[PDB]
Amino acid sequence: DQRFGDLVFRQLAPNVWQHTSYLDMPGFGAVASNGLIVRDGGRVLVVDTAWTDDQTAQILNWIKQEINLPVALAVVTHAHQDKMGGMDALHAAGIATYANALSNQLAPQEGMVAAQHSLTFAANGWVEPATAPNFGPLKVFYPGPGHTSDNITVGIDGTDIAFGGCLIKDSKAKSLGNLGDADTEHYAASARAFGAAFPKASMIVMSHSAPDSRAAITHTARMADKLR
Ligand SMILES: [O-]
Ligand SMILES: [Zn+2]
Ligand SMILES: [Zn+2]
Fold first, then answer.
1. Could you state a single Gene Ontology molecular function term?
2. Domain containing 160: what range?
3. Which residues, by Cβ under 5 Å, contact ligand 2, an ion?
């Protein structure tokens, strides 16, 4: 771990880092949220903001210090604060932003600023390629409704890594966390669909646990079986 102001950065693979930020959540504690930073040749790609604009500006500062290449785009994985709370900071920095069309639709009512561009998805869940131009190694997949109706996931080509966002919890998790906006009927199938989309991914990264094996996926789905 590298502490950088109030955030934490951890290298996961040669061109991939995890960013972590915290929100002191009244009546629960200081909740960590993770996203990703990927170097693709001469540019950087970001998955998820931090909780806040100030924290997200700090992610960009860290990138400037440790990579020193332009951030070409960011993709955010649903319309909750941990994933989209720093959209204004990305826009202030001139970074092109992307989210599920449904996330952009929901953003205002969720208290988020919408991304500039909307991703749409084929019936099988893969992003429609025209809506994710210049995504390089980022392979975006909509697994179905689970943690939220709009949750999306991202594999990183050239690595063993897939990112489940808030859909997936680690293999020792006691619960499925914040289910306030969850789809209880479809959660288990959506978790399994994420696994099936990225079958070779041996490192599963997620919002609220450290990176884990694929047991994160099986355990999450098995817990979600109890929601039905
Ligand atoms: O979330
Ligand atoms: Zn969420
Ligand atoms: Zn979350």
1. zinc ion binding
2. 1-228
3. 80, 166
